[PDB]
Design a protein around this ligand. Structure first.
Ligand SMILES: [Cu+2]
Ligand SMILES: [Cu+]
Length: 74
């Protein structure tokens, strides 16, 4: 699993916060306990002024998962 070890949260200025997965891909998860399909390239700016582009536009990851080997075949 080691999922607990992995963690990422960029405080967006829109009150929301992106969350990346193991594939380094991002995840547009709104603080409203829901997801928001943000189109790739929609530059997101953190409160600290950190420029982060919506790389992983595939938010589908959040919605459940196939539970990969969390190791082999990264
Ligand atoms: Cu593991
Ligand atoms: Cu985003």
């Amino acid at each position: 699993v080691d999922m607990s070890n992995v963690v990422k949260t960029y405080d967006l200025q829109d009150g929301s916060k992106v969350h990346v997965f193991k594939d380094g891909k991002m995840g547009m998860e709104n603080k409203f306990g829901k997801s928001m399909n943000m189109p790739e390239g929609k530059v997101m700016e953190t409160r600290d002024g950190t420029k982060i582009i919506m790389k992983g536009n595939e938010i589908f990851r959040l919605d459940e998962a196939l539970r990969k080997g969390h190791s082999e075949g990264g």
